[PDB]
Design a binder for this molecule. Sequence first.
Ligand SMILES: *[C@@H]1O[C@H](CO)[C@@H](O)[C@H](O)[C@H]1NC(C)=O
Ligand SMILES: *[C@@H]1O[C@H](CO)[C@@H](O)[C@H](O)[C@H]1NC(C)=O
Ligand SMILES: *[C@@H]1O[C@H](CO)[C@@H](O)[C@H](O)[C@H]1NC(C)=O
Ligand SMILES: *[C@@H]1O[C@H](CO)[C@@H](O)[C@H](O)[C@H]1NC(C)=O
Ligand SMILES: [Ca+2]
Ligand SMILES: [Ca+2]
Ligand SMILES: [Ca+2]
Ligand SMILES: [Ca+2]
Ligand SMILES: [Ca+2]
Ligand SMILES: [Ca+2]
Ligand SMILES: [Ca+2]
Ligand SMILES: [Ca+2]
Ligand SMILES: [Ca+2]
Ligand SMILES: [Ca+2]
Ligand SMILES: [Ca+2]
Ligand SMILES: [Ca+2]
Lengths: 36, 272, 272, 265, 265, 141
Amino acid sequence: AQANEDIVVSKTSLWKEMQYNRDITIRFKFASSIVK
Amino acid sequence: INLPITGSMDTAYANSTQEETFLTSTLCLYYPTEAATEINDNSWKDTLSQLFLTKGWPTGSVYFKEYTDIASFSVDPQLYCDYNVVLMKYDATLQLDMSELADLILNEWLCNPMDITLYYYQQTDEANKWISMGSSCTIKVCPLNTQTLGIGCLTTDTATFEEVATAEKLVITDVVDGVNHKLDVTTATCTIRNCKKLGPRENVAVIQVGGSDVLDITADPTTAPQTERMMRINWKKWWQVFYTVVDYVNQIIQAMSKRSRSLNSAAFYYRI
Amino acid sequence: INLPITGSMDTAYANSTQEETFLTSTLCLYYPTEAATEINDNSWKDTLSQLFLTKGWPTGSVYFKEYTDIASFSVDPQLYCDYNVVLMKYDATLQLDMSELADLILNEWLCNPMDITLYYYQQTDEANKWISMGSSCTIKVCPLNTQTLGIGCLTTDTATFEEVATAEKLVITDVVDGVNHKLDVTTATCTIRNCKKLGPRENVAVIQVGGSDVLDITADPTTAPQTERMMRINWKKWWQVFYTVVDYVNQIIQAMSKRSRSLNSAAFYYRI
Amino acid sequence: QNYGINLPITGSMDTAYANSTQEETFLTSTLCLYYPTEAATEINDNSWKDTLSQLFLTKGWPTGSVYFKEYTDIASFSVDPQLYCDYNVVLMKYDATLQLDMSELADLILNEWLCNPMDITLYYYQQTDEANKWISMGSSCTIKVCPLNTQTLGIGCLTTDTATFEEVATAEKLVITDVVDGVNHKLDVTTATCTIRNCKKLGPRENVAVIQVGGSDVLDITADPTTAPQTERMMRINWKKWWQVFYTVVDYVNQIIQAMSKRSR
Amino acid sequence: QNYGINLPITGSMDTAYANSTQEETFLTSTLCLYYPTEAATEINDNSWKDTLSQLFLTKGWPTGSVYFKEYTDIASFSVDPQLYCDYNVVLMKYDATLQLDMSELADLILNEWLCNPMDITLYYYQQTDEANKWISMGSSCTIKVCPLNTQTLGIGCLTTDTATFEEVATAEKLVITDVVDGVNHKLDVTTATCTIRNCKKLGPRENVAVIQVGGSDVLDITADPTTAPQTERMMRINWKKWWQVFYTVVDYVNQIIQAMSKRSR
Amino acid sequence: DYWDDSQAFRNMVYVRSLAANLNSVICTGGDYSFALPVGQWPVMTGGAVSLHSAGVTLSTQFTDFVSLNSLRFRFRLTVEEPSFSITRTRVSRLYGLPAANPNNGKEYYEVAGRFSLISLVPSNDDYQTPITNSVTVRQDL
Ligand SMILES: *[C@@H]1O[C@H](CO)[C@@H](O)[C@H](O)[C@H]1NC(C)=O
Ligand SMILES: *[C@@H]1O[C@H](CO)[C@@H](O)[C@H](O)[C@H]1NC(C)=O
Ligand SMILES: *[C@@H]1O[C@H](CO)[C@@H](O)[C@H](O)[C@H]1NC(C)=O
Ligand SMILES: *[C@@H]1O[C@H](CO)[C@@H](O)[C@H](O)[C@H]1NC(C)=O
Ligand SMILES: [Ca+2]
Ligand SMILES: [Ca+2]
Ligand SMILES: [Ca+2]
Ligand SMILES: [Ca+2]
Ligand SMILES: [Ca+2]
Ligand SMILES: [Ca+2]
Ligand SMILES: [Ca+2]
Ligand SMILES: [Ca+2]
Ligand SMILES: [Ca+2]
Ligand SMILES: [Ca+2]
Ligand SMILES: [Ca+2]
Ligand SMILES: [Ca+2]
């Protein structure tokens, strides 16, 4: 299985239950408030 | 060929194809550096050729190919001849390595490549394995669940992976067939290939020069067989080894049989 | 049951009882602390359970039982499961110890106690042996002649006796059958029992993880057998060993067969 | 000689009644009493075992066939009872504070269990039939259990917070736990001191015989509160001494061993 | 399923032609184009491979069936050309200073060689028929040959003095040497940098296809200077760009794969 | 909270079977110089703390430009050896992280992960859920 798969576990006419299995690179950052 | 063959039990036994298969075939020995070191002679190859000449093999039919070590030979072996003999030194610190070498050369493998980054693979049957070659192979695996996450491991934190190899030149790996594994490999230094074990290679013959029979070709623990072309010797020199091989070369090549699959100089077929 | 059984050869081969024996049976591994150490993970048991689950063995049927040393395990081994696997390391200095362990768990024994001080015992057949368990057993024996005197020993001088064990946690002693022996044992730390070897235990499977075949189950120096639930692996890691045992557990259980005699947790029956 | 197989055995009704096996089963079998320390204490003698064996001799049990094995208390004997003989008798004192202990002991020894192991940390167990129970032994067992629902969540308990669990045992040396059959239970146990085993009750063990030395019949062997049986090898006695008890056991050992039958297994 | 044998196969002329195996071989096969660095350089794009795969998709070849493998120079490709695919195309640029090199390349890949090793230092070799040649691969081959007479002495050369030897290769990466068949030769080769193998030619390799992007038909596969053939899978093109060459390969891949047949070996 | 331009987050409003494998990292505080008018300049320097993976949920990232139905990764903290201390002051050797310069002059804190879910997406792969915003909240403020 690919590292970035996308699969369908159920599908009706308009809707569909899609499975997703994916790798991510969370690059976040704090931020500080300074009140003097 | 899909067609059948027919025969009979009344026909006569033909003459010996020996003394002609010799002429129209080539022989190749694989000796360790230790042999030439203990010998300290520069014409031993021509000597052994002149000896083989009595057994029938003509002058330009025998060949010798040095290999510094079992693992340096295990790194992408290339057996390109018609009758190969290998002389293998025994060491309990190298048992699995010189069993994997056996499993690789005695058998005939059909190998596809592997892209670990873009794909996650699995073994279908008890003949599919992963064989990895290079200078230092460190292989770790995380088995996966139905939703493509980890089982006793973290799909990202490579420290949580499960180590099946540590700085090994040739690794033959079998994992639980039916689940998807995420791999981590030293791809810079090692290539890994998904290989299926076909019928055996009857062109080569391993000769364990020292200790008792330990080679377990079959990765399953139940069989532990001993094929006909897996021989053993007890040794204290190397000239006696080579004289014994030359004296009993007919039995060896009667235990061996030319190939049927194809013409190929590597130790494994490639089918992408 | 004493009655006879009858059958035929026209009757049909019923379906595979595998995939139902897995559901209605239990599997139990006996691994060394070395393996837990080299693994250094606190979820590998759940990992292997989830793996086995694909082979059919349900969750609550697979069990793991750590044993620190071959000798510590040899001290009254307690197997109470329907399918027992044992992973046994190889050490030349422990060859006879890990052979006696095999001889004890693979086979089924019927044991009576022994009262050394009050009585003097002998062996009758080639299966009546004296098995001694404990933390440090040092055994000595004096054979006796027809008229209850010593032969190469004195009935009083414990130093004239013939030593057969030196601080061994498990010993299996075979002496000459037909003569009475006076014993001296460290009874404070060890218990010795006169046991008869019955038919084999088909519930257990030994797996020598390391070197060449050394186990001589039978005491007589003529058979040197190799049974079916006695395997051999060549190893450099332990995750490969466990993945192998898992991928090939069906061959193991096909090599094993549930017991016939009775329900028992010990490795030997007691009948006083 | 076919083992592991069960075949139909035939018979008749005109065959004659073969001779008595008593006075030979004694010679070719062994007997083993399990007496409490209280009895030897009251006796205060160092030859009473030899005396009882010399008496047994008259009933046919030879010297090296009878054995005595002492135990300090009912629970200390409940911890892993090893009844390994051809005939076992167990003298048992009555105390209202130990009724359940000496019912569990009876349930354990009188019956022949098939015990498989258990691994609490990983697996969550359930009882399938009315004969599957969890027997825990050791020096101090403290067991708590949480039933679970269809989606692996708790019922009046939290899978994480062990305190929320329901306590069925509190520092018991032997516990036989029967819970509702059909619901996966998560357990917490003092595994450092106790071992717990999933045991299915097979047919009874006809090789043992419990003798309650004091009070009325109390032993509710069957977990189901409907049978409340009283087998043939569940005896009762009134006592003001112990020498009288032992003389009685001796003088009526034949009926005892007629009520006891050697094992099948 | 009999391997290692060759038996007769029978048929007839009444049975009817099957459906087109095209549109299924494309789905269960692999295709591999070998382009030169000049092409990527002139194109100057990093998605041209995905583009060509998307185009092949219109022809039926799926996404991961088509592979592109660069080769900086004809000689760098001649050095151990490893074609491991079920269909191989090789775009080859013409250069009148490289005719023989890129004809040896053709004679190597188009044909199927049974290659055995060679130990120059010990043995003196001869050729047996018009298909046994000596093919040498490496970084810098410098081969010299001394023919010998019946009495193991040289002809116009001295068995010791290497400068007397006759030169047939100097600073070549791939050589294919054909010499007189029936006389023992002695060799001097740069074994450190080139490995030489005694190789017998067999039936062709119908799995690879050469495409001369530029100049006229010059490839003389056949050593014997009487045939000068032009096989079905030795094609030619005229070029002023490379996008047109790739679009042409795409638009006429079916013809190419009808000209190529999967290997027997 | 995390969000991408991938197909997983295009119309995600419903999610089940949620789970993720995240690796642990170490967040180290920096050096904040309290710029006093006159005198000395105390500097709050130090502080290290290891973030370990924890449960996962959903959330909504609200901003003045985009609104995102996003994936919420939690992290728990285990105090590390480097402590934070205000220099030229009677405070030191107290674990935690300071809220003045947590980044330590870094552009970001990187951590790789994998996520696995099951969402409800209209069968037609052309539907779009509103992302952008135009906010006028807190007019009283
Ligand atoms: C086979 O051997 C026999 C005995 O030497 C000989 O007479 C016969 O000619 C041989 N066969 C052929 C085809 O030469
Ligand atoms: C026996 O095996 C056959 C073949 O798989 C199957 O069709 C049949 O249903 C099986 N019968 C039983 C009773 O398991
Ligand atoms: C059985 O008992 C009768 C009466 O005591 C006796 O005569 C007979 O011999 C006994 N059977 C055997 C086999 O001794
Ligand atoms: C063979 O080709 C014909 C013509 O297109 C088609 O009708 C037929 O279905 C094909 N055969 C099979 C087995 O599909
Ligand atoms: Ca190896
Ligand atoms: Ca792990
Ligand atoms: Ca496998
Ligand atoms: Ca021993
Ligand atoms: Ca002596
Ligand atoms: Ca004996
Ligand atoms: Ca109790
Ligand atoms: Ca509660
Ligand atoms: Ca119950
Ligand atoms: Ca050339
Ligand atoms: Ca010359
Ligand atoms: Ca020629």
